[PDB]
Design a binder for this molecule. Structure first.
Ligand code: CA
Ligand code: CA
Lengths: 604, 604
């Protein structure tokens, strides 16, 4: 029974006939394994039966491997050929919610694809406790939003009506009031109130437990399963940061476009629309960033893709890092900053002015860009994988695909299946490490981003199950362990996540400015109250600006001793911002030190 | 030739005679190795000749090892028996400065003691580049101290003479002027000026390079050489923090003693004297902390000392951490804080007041406590090791000790030598990890603390060479690698050092308050000058206090809007303190990420 099938005319022909000769123990050439004699050199099962015959295909070149032989063009394809159950209890409609038979991914696909499919299946249950603490925040961020006087002053037009602010832009830009920030700041109080600073502190607890409990999990998965130089790297990173700023400026021009033609408030309709339009070009500029990441690595020194696990990963992911997240690193740490003396922008070192944010925290503009990137990439990378097959279950496959595991010699049909690609699950880990660096990078806001990534991870655990089972020409059942190049990147994201979640709460969410006013401006030092009460916070926080209106900034009022230089309060909150950065990092980095000390990695 | 020598009466006698029987292939019993037959079970040289016969002594107990046999009392001692050169070119006066033959510590003592003696020898050259950048600071902290107007106002009695401060203590405590802080603040400007915030940033660069270049070094050393549970651990840490605060209060009462009987200013003579008196009791309370660390581990569960490498290390070092450093963690983060409304102390939750620091930064009280702890422990732990032998080279040893390597059967003389102790180089790594967590914990101040620890590490590299060669009964040449339990502790000190050096500069050194005044109070916002100049900083920084005098604090003057609550400036500097914590950690933790990425660990 079959294990692997292969498929200037006479000049390449003599290059081909000599390799098949010592392999011996259109028309497609069968193999079958002499089977034992290469099973002792490396340390039955049809998934293993394709392994050893690929190990046979590894050593013997020619006299004058299919690495350069298929890349030259002599061969057109070389490919291989339990499956019935993986369409029923693990694939689609006949049943879709049943626990994943991960040891029956060893049975078919091994651990190249299993260590993604248990890292996905662990991720989903680890997103389950992370989504109820999104629903918990959705409970007391919305249902508790009837008294909290953050999003009650802003929607009462008596506390939030007469608050006449300044324009942001220069021309065609109004003196816009408050009471136009209510439909955004009635749902803003579910994203920030108290159970996000519980939740992001929980997320920092979560991601540093998501790691370590997976570190115990993959150890259990390791248990149940087997076991000129500084000049060349310079001009690869140096053209890169020149192309980072293209991606940072990609959103902003498409921020310069849609905001003109426009003007369920239109402000939510626009922030959806620009995060659709920027989602178009980040879908486009993703294609270029794969092609300019290949041509920099082949212009880099020789190693087959096998070294691109260390080099294309650190370039193509890190392009995707810049392509996806450095737009969101704009709406978060660089958008809302740099207003000055006459509302002085930094003018962005050119002839135009720079742009500002709104007085609710600029987190809502993030949290919809966060939503419909990670929930648009969830759609678009699970609609692209039902459009490649150009149908969803055309043929019946009721008694036929049982037979395709029975015997059913069909390799003319398996030639029609698309090849897996030269890089395997590199493109599939990429769209999840992109998702994982969305659930943990910008999560203070939108705590249901686990739930959105939960029902995604009930489908993506099943749609990637389905296209591996039905659609793709079968990948070689390679045995790897420790998923590899992403685990320093996940920890590289997670240590960056403890910084950036804390920088989300401090520098792009006005909850520390709320925390402080509760504790240090409604006490009678600088305040007018008896005990702690959040009454009167929206007038009590911002800076007036004489016509020589308020703007989202902590600055001395004009007509005071040192005006448009900061306050005690810009100084206190930025000192409490920087303390919250300092405290919550030194606690989460201690709990990361404690929890990894509290439980050993190897299985109990 | 000899490899290892051993040495109710009849009741213990029958327990003894049966072990020697199958070992066969006062009066001291020789051994010599049947030598080959245990050299294949584990994977010539007299240093190895004592290894394999100790490996022979490992398996065969008795029928009814010297672990429990010498601990019971049947045996009185069991011990073992190239050496001429290690007294000449590596030991003392005949020659003392010659490069250490570290591979000739493999020749005699192996890698139990060699991996300390190359970790010391690397440490010394890595303290050499760290001491010139102490001399560089000693150049432009002293020789540049003629204009800097920090320590020129304080010694000019015209800028620092009329500055009439407040008392610190309550009774017998004066209204003390300035011009009594000049002899301390003429040498204060060598400890803090610019080339300490270069140097501590250099130290944070240094310790994160001291690690990684040793990580490359020990890899080269690995290359050239071989290859109820939560309830029991609770009440060990819970009685401990009750004994931490004894060590914190150990200094303060001996701060309450000497400061009464007293009152080259007497203030330098007192800070030497109390850091002599606290050095007495920390020498005393060290003895208790060894005895209460043993009796907690034998009251903990059974493992011979072999598990005490993981448990006595994490208790006895961590006692020494608390015994030595938590006095210096008092003079640094908890001494100079908590002054309040009528100069309100926190009263230390009792019937007495609390105590304050001086207006130069409280770093000088640290830097002499830092000096004469680490330079008194350098004396006392290298005078205790010339007093145990009760002489230094009594006998001639010119042609005799050459003969002790020639043959010279002398085991009656080697019985007189003191035993090495049950724990080996645990007490010798301890006094250096104590020194290493002095060079890197509290180093912003005293940049010659590498040079003090350099000439120490020319003697300690030689006095520990000498007592290993002449004095001690020879340790068993055990082969270990990665020095072990201290390498997570060194990295545990070093990641704590990046925090605490930055917390030295910010929270216990007024250089950030100098940095800020240079940049943000002598510009005309809040200032009265044309360009940046450090003129007028000592009046311009502190808080007046109506009789209702200045004190080292950033507070609103009485008779202002919200008095004795902080300023823009307490708010700016503490925001720039916390930023300097944030920036220099995120740069040093990035350079730690960059340098460990820049160079691979395994040898080139
Ligand atoms: Ca997929
Ligand atoms: Ca010593």
């Amino acid at each position: 029974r079959i294990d692997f099938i292969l498929v200037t005319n006479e000049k390449q022909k003599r290059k081909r006939q000599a390799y098949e000769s010592n392999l011996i123990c259109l028309v497609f050439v069968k193999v079958h394994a002499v089977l034992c004699t290469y099973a002792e050199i490396m340390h039955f099962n049809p998934a293993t039966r394709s392994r050893i015959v690929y190990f046979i295909l590894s050593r013997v070149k020619y006299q004058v491997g299919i690495n350069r032989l298929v890349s030259s063009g002599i061969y057109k394809a070389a490919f291989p050929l339990e499956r019935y159950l993986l369409y029923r209890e693990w694939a689609h409609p006949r049943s879709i919610y049943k626990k994943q038979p991960l040891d029956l991914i060893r049975k078919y696909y091994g651990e190249k694809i299993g260590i993604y499919f248990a890292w996905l299946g662990y991720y989903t249950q680890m997103l389950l406790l992370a989504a109820v603490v999104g629903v918990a925040c959705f409970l007391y961020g919305y249902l508790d939003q009837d008294n909290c006087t953050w999003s009650k002053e802003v929607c009462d037009p008596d506390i939030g009506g007469q608050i006449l602010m300044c324009p942001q832009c220069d021309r065609l830009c109004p003196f816009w009031r408050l009471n136009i920030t209510c439909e955004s700041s009635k749902k803003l109080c579910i994203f920030d109130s108290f159970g996000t600073l519980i939740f992001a502190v929980f997320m920092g607890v979560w991601v540093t437990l998501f790691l370590e409990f997976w570190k115990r999990r993959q150890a259990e998965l390791e248990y149940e399963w087997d076991t000129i130089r500084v000049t060349l790297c310079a001009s690869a990173v140096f053209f890169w940061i020149l192309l980072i700023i293209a991606s940072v400026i990609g959103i902003i021009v498409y921020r310069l476009s849609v905001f003109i033609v426009f003007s369920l408030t239109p402000q939510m309709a626009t922030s959806i629309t620009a995060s659709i339009i920027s989602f178009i070009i980040i879908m486009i500029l993703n294609t270029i960033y794969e092609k300019v990441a290949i041509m920099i690595t082949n212009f880099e020194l020789p190693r087959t893709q096998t070294d691109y696990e260390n080099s294309l990963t650190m370039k193509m992911f890190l392009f995707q890092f810049v392509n996806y997240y450095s737009s969101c690193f704009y709406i978060a740490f660089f958008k809302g900053k740099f207003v000055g003396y006459p509302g002085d922008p930094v003018y962005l070192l050119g002839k135009y002015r720079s742009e500002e944010c709104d007085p609710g925290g600029c987190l809502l503009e993030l949290t919809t860009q966060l939503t419909i990137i990670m929930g648009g990439k969830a759609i678009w990378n699970n609609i692209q994988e039902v459009l490649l097959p150009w149908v969803m279950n055309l043929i019946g496959r009721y008694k036929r695909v049982s037979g395709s595991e029975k015997i059913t010699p069909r390799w003319e049909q398996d030639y029609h299946l698309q090849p897996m690609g030269k890089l395997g699950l590199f493109y599939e880990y990429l769209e999840m490490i992109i998702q994982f660096g969305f659930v943990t990078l910008f999560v203070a806001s939108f705590p249901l981003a686990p739930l959105l990534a939960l029902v995604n991870n009930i489908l993506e655990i099943r749609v990637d199950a389905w296209k591996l089972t039905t659609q793709f020409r079968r990948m070689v059942p390679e045995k790897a362990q420790d998923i590899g190049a992403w685990q320093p990147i996940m920890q590289g994201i997670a240590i960056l996540a403890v910084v950036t979640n804390a920088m989300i709460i401090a520098f792009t969410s006005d909850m520390i400015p709320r925390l402080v006013y509760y504790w240090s401006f409604s006490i009678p030092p600088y305040g007018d109250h008896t005990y702690y009460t959040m009454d009167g916070y929206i007038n009590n926080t911002l800076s007036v600006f004489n016509i020589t209106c308020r703007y989202r900034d902590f600055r001395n009022p004009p007509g005071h001793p040192q005006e448009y230089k900061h306050n005690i309060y810009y100084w206190h909150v930025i000192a409490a911002k920087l303390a919250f950065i300092i405290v919550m990092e030194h606690i989460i980095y201690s709990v990361k030190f404690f929890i990894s000390y509290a439980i050993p990695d190897v299985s109990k």
